[PDB]
Design a protein around this ligand. Structure first.
Ligand SMILES: C[C@H](CCC[C@H](C)C(=O)O)[C@H]1CC[C@H]2[C@@H]3CC=C4C=C(O)CC[C@]4(C)[C@H]3CC[C@]12C
Lengths: 242, 13
């Protein structure tokens, strides 16, 4: 039987609990103002991603799996995985018809166009744009729009082995959860789709390679295009602006 | 990465 057992259902409930605030409203402030501007600048894009980044930190801090790590292990995982998780949120939030990202607390008139890439650093913008579109295209529409699938992919990439993590128990915990989240994702998809799920599982390593590549090559995208006085600091820890 | 560390280490309650 492909039906989920109690432990699998409970793991999914816990994941949904940890992610439950990602879609909360924004408060008035720099980030909301940036999302609401029709004419967005590169700095506005940084201000927008700040919301998602802050919320990923909070999500992780709810997970028992994350809380079994040392503080240094937790820090290394977030630093190493932030942009990868952000890119997966980007796939969930991208509308192929409109060629834009939206957010679930604002209407369709509020968006970030794919063509915002055309304003970024010419050294890297073209291939980052193409990589994002190619990554988006490998997903089936009903899978990239499934919040539980997206959340699990985020956790699979968050719980990746990182060379800087040296505590042996941290490394063990990370490896075990990488495996567990991958297996749970496949079980979930089997419970919905039966044998047809297996093709999705077979594609996961291809997806992850594309995800790691795009995220690892993102760091200079804003260089020369942003004044630090206009952009949130957290994204500036991941993207070099000066 | 001072701000990432701060956000990780803060009491969100
Ligand atoms: C997910 C986000 C839109 C919704 C944000 C909102 C606060 C929410 O999470 O609901 C979009 C807006 C800009 C996108 C990045 C632009 C360039 C990028 C450059 C790349 O090389 C990869 C992907 C990213 C990081 C994009 C990921 C998704 C972002 C953060």
């Amino acid at each position: 039987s492909y039906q989920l057992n109690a432990a699998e259902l409970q793991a999914l409930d816990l994941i949904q609990e940890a992610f439950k605030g990602m879609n909360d409203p924004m408060e008035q402030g720099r980030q909301a103002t940036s999302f609401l501007k029709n004419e967005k600048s590169p700095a506005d894009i940084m201000n927008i991603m700040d919301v998602t980044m802050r919320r990923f930190v909070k999500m992780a801090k709810r997970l028992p799996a994350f809380n079994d790590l040392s503080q240094d292990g937790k820090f290394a995982l977030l630093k190493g995985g932030m942009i990868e998780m952000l890119t997966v949120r980007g796939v969930r939030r991208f509308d192929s018809s409109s060629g834009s990202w939206t957010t679930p607390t604002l209407g369709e008139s509020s968006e970030v166009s794919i063509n915002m890439f055309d304003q970024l650093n010419a050294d890297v913008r073209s291939e980052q744009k193409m990589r994002f579109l190619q990554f988006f295209k490998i997903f089936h529409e009903d899978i990239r729009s499934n919040d539980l699938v997206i959340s699990m992919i985020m956790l699979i990439v968050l719980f990746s082995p990182r060379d800087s993590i040296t505590d042996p128990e941290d490394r063990r915990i990370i490896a075990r959860h990488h495996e567990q989240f991958s297996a749970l994702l496949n079980r979930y998809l089997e419970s919905l789709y039966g044998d047809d799920a297996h093709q999705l599982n077979e594609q996961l390593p291809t997806a992850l390679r594309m995800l790691r590549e795009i995220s690892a090559s993102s760091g200079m995208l804003f260089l020369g295009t942003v004044n630090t006085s206009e952009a949130e600091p957290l994204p500036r820890e991941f993207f070099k602006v000066e | 990465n001072a701000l990432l560390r701060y956000l990780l280490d803060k009491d969100d309650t």
